Amino acid sequence: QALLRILKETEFKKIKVLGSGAFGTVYKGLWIPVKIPVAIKELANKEILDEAYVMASVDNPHVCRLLGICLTSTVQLITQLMPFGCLLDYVREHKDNIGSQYLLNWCVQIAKGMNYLEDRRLVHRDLAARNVLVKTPQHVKITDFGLAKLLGAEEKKVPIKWMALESILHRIYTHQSDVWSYGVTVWELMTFGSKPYDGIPASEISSILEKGERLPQPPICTIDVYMIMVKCWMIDADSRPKFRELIIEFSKMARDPQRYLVIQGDERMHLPSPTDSNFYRALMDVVDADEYL
Numbered sequence: 102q103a104l105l106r107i108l109k110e111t112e113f114k115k116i117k118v119l120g121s122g123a124f125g126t127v128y129k130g131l132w133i134p135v136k137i138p139v140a141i142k143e144l145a146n147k148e149i150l151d152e153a154y155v156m157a158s159v160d161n162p163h164v165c166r167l168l169g170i171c172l173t174s175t176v177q178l179i180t181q182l183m184p185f186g187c188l189l190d191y192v193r194e195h196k197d198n199i200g201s202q203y204l205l206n207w208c209v210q211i212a213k214g215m216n217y218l219e220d221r222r223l224v225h226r227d228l229a230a231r232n233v234l235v236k237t238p239q240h241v242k243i244t245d246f247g248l249a250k251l252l253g254a255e256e257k258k259v260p261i262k263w264m265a266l267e268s269i270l271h272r273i274y275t276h277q278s279d280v281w282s283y284g285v286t287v288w289e290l291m292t293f294g295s296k297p298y299d300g301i302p303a304s305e306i307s308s309i310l311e312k313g314e315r316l317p318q319p320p321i322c323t324i325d326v327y328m329i330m331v332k333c334w335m336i337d338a339d340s341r342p343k344f345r346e347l348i349i350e351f352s353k354m355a356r357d358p359q360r361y362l363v364i365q366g367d368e369r370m371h372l373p374s375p376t377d378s379n380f381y382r383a384l385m386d387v388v389d390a391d392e393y394l
């Protein structure tokens with residue numbers, strides 16, 4: 102009945118590699134406590150477990166939950182597999198079939214998730230489109246929260262181009278610095294996955310921000326939507342929107358989406374279902390974690 106399950110190595114299997122780089126490697130696999138499709142991230146134990154418990158205790162439709170942990174020579178984190186992958190890749194791949202309704206609903210959902218994390222007094226520290234996952238095209242969930250602090254990023258690689266200026270200069274992380282990163286995430290979605298400050302070295306970012314330069318208005322965005330982003334990047338952290346306010350504003354916009362985003366052929370767009378999705382098939386072709394719990 103443990104909220105954070107301690108898994109023996111024999112209780113899970115890595116089947117294929119999903120992704121790799123800095124922070125480790127994530128595999129697609131099965132948890133066999135019945136067979137449950139999972140992602141497995143392979144990156145003091147007493148402290149690591151304390152932090153992992155918080156990640157296992159979250160219960161919100163827009164926040165991923167840790168299902169289990171395996172502590173050996175490495176730390177392995179086990180979570181439900183999200184069969185459509187990350188939202189960044191998703192928007193890059195489906196840029197010709199993503200309409201205004203979907204983009205605005207994703208903004209709402211991410212804000213709901215982050216508001217929930219704020220209620221849990223949990224600062225994410227690494228919100229980005231790569232860290233939002235697609236359960237279905239209509240339902241996204243935030244992941245990878247609290248790794249930054251568990252690793253020790255408040256002390257002594259950092260995602261500079263998503264960080265609030267106070268995080269860069271003074272390693273200050275708050276729910277308001279998460280609002281800045283939220284702004285960058287929304288910008289990533291509205292540009293269908295452009296790289297922020299592309300071609301500009303990370304070492305120059307603080308000076309650029311101090312000069313008042315920001316990410317440019319996405320072609321599809323009305324000024325109303327861009328102003329939300331710009332407000333997320335104000336130097337005065339206390340003046341940035343709160344996630345509660347962002348839920349309200351984007352929910353209002355989602356009720357009349359074509360007023361707020363101007364997308365060529367918005368009306369006639371269609372995203373692949375599980376049966377038609379190459380990606381879903383690539384992953385899946387016996388019991389979903391939700392059904393198991």
Ligand SMILES: CC(C)(O)CC(=O)NCCn1ccc2ncnc(Nc3ccc(Oc4cccc(C(F)(F)F)c4)c(Cl)c3)c21
Nearest residue numbers: 119120127140142156165166167178182183186244245246
């Ligand atoms: C990171 C990266 C840079 O985006 C690379 C990358 O993760 N690539 C694979 C992406 N991926 C694709 C389908 C898929 N399904 C599920 N989890 C994925 N990724 C994932 C991300 C973070 C994980 O670890 C954490 C850490 C902290 C908190 C949580 C929690 F679940 F509580 F939110 C999980 C794990 Cl185990 C897996 C998935």
